[PDB]
Amino acid sequence: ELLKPRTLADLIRILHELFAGDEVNVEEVQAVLEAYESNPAEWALYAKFDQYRYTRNLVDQGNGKFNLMILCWGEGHGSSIHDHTDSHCFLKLLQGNLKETLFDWPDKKSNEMIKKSERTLRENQCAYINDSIGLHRVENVSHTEPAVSLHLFSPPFDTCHAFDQRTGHKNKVTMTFHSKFGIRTP
Numbered sequence: 001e002l003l004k005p006r007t008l009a010d011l012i013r014i015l016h017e018l019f020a021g022d023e024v025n026v027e028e029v030q031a032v033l034e035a036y037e038s039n040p041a042e043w044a045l046y047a048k049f050d051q052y053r054y055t056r057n058l059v060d061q062g063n064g065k066f067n068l069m070i071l072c073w074g075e076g077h078g079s080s081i082h083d084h085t086d087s088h089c090f091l092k093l094l095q096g097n098l099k100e101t102l103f104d105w106p107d108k109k110s111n112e113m114i115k116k117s118e119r120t121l122r123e124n125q126c127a128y129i130n131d132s133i134g135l136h137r138v139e140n141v142s143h144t145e146p147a148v149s150l151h152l153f154s155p156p157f158d159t160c161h162a163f164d165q166r167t168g169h170k171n172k173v174t175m176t177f178h179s180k181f182g183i184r185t186p
């Protein structure tokens with residue numbers, strides 16, 4: 001029985017219920033994430049930017065079965081082309097816009113990775129990816145506006161692969177945290 005989250009806090013409580021069991025109802029999770037109306041005051045604590053690249057800010061450690069974080073993207077900041085380590089990944093915009101470009105898993109052949117599609121994710125929208133869908137790149141293409149997104153990963157994971165668009169070659173990356181629970185984590 002899914003209800004609208006009134007606040008980020010409420011959203012988090014609801015996520016603990018949704019992940020109370022062993023399996024994930026993706027459509028239900030995506031629905032509740034979307035239903036949350038971004039309130040900049042509720043997440044300002046987590047919205048820590050860096051001048052040079054996007055930051056990953058842990059919000060909730062979950063119940064062992066998921067994590068929740070906020071990512072902050074300066075003008076022109078973007079990600080690698082990357083996977084998500086056999087986890088569910090949900091992305092909701094809290095501020096600004098992000099361009100998401102989808103790529104297919106590369107063949108063993110060295111080949112230019114060609115964009116399967118792109119979309120503009122706008123404030124409050126919740127997107128979903130998993131490895132069965134493909135790979136993606138996420139970018140703030142704005143010249144004038146920062147972006148902020150809310151991400152849920154289940155199970156949690158701290159490693160992923162980056163892919164070279166020219167070749168499809170992958171490299172294993174360890175993902176870091178800029179902050180945890182509002183506290184900067186050098």
Ligand SMILES: [Fe+3]
Pocket residue numbers: 082083084089136138
């Ligand atoms: Fe991603």
